[PDB]
RNA sequence: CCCCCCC
RNA sequence: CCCCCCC
RNA sequence: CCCCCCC
């Protein structure tokens, strides 16, 4: 059945159309040196409103890939959003859907903070501490990638995890910019990813275009590391299933587990059939996701969760254990094997 | 014989003609923003009559796919129903076959409820609690998809299951709209699916056009999840047969089971021959369904039902057990293997 | 005739 | 319906 | 995020 369902979904002669009357903003590569400034003036000043930081990160992505490539990416993502270009005025940027009041506020706040830290201090600002640093857009996109790995999770868990992991992953940027509010920027990125779902596809295309590069700075290598940490998002049950098989859990040989193993292997075969893009299904909110669910094998899922709980892997996972006796037996065996 | 029967049914040079003098209603995409309102004014008010909620969900489907694509879908489903377009009047909708009194009643009831909940309360209605929310048509179609998975079952079982599953599947919508009557909407959808059988084909085409989409909201992902839960409808005996084979039931090696295994494998080969569209045969009430029946293998069916009963899968399945001795032996072995 | 559980 | 830990 | 010794 599962192969037939995927065959129906894949073999479609008709293309969906959505967001027909909508538009979005991009910034041409000719403005990259400008957007960098903006992407850094968000980082070293303490701003009251961090509402469009995610849009500025996506603007930098658009400068990197190019306006035409970004339009093509949005078009092949199933969304008929018409790209609107970015202009300059007196210079500053007039990004579509980003209020000019916001851009002026961010610029003025950063200029005032820079003046205050230059007047009082000894005037020895290093090359990495200024807003026009060239890795500041990647530093913002690193907060974006941290909150990207938690798009399958909830908002509160995502924000808490983003802040906790960014105090260590982004320690160097925090030292360079003492006053960068990872919570508010992470909230902005979560809002962008939820509202504009095609920007998930744009962000993934940037991740690919960055990982495929021949050279990169440490910021881009960090961004790619986090982006790849997001790969199996929304499918931790499959990873824990292969973990359970590697652990040689005895309760995998139970009668009901052996009964469901056929369709479990069917799900894994479907994973292989989709191939490399299967991992990005839940990150993209591809409607085709959910063909990879193991919820139709309650006993296998309970055994997998029990094995994870025994090994300590389960952590604070919020999934359901359908069959509690199998869960407890598997947990006991996994603890025994671990000890 | 079974391959020959399918060859006769498939190799037909003549097309059937039905519903020749009949007509049905569609709504053009230009009215989607309007139909959404209607599809949500059914959800947050307590209506005396929920008679045409299913037709309003199908109207939203018609806006999504388009009027011309919907006409083509109805034509290729074997039904010569002439599509009638939807108009507006003073604005509200005049849907063909939907009485204007009903639309006026629903709109007035929703407006009165909104006025009552705005006058008494503190006036802090969130963006998701209002009728013009853009996921309300998908919320109605989710009740429709829940009752869709029970079209092979009976009406009472379908309604009971729809309400039971919708208290959990649709918990968030229920929180957003405290007064949405899943029983009456489910009854309306069951009535639509029984009366207009071509709307099963339309609803399946919407499911495909939604699953094939590159992006979607959580409502559309939920709808696709339920729609795929409906895939093997009307053929639980085949699923339980492959379950029995996976369980390695000893009574499958009995003399009579081994006698019938040849034509059983013939049925499964026919399943593979039809391919992806085989699962939707009973959902569509395709007359070609019934070639997949295992009723001509009473001993295999009894063994399969016994295995299911032993594993606890049988639940409250109402199929017949032809050979009770095989059923009991298979149930005993399945319980023994499970323990 | 067929279908019939749970998710 | 699905998802849900850590890195 | 990754890396981190010796030759």
Numbering used by the authors:
A (entry chain E), B (entry chain C): 10 to 99, 112 to 360
Verbatim from the authors:
The viral genome is encapsidated in a sheath of oligomerized copies of the nucleoprotein N, forming a ribonucleoprotein complex termed nucleocapsid. The nucleocapsid is the template for transcription and replication by L, which is also dependent on the obligate polymerase cofactor, the phosphoprotein P, together forming the active L/P holoenzyme. An important function of the C-terminal domain of P in nsNSVs is to bind to assembled N-RNA, forming an N-RNA/P complex.
However, 11-mer oligomers (black arrow), 12-mer oligomers (white arrow), and short coil-like segments, denoted as spiral particles, are also present in the preparation (red arrow). As the map quality was globally too limited for atomic refinement we restricted ourselves to rigid-body placement of N-RNA protomers. We were able to rigid body fit 12 protomers of N into the map.
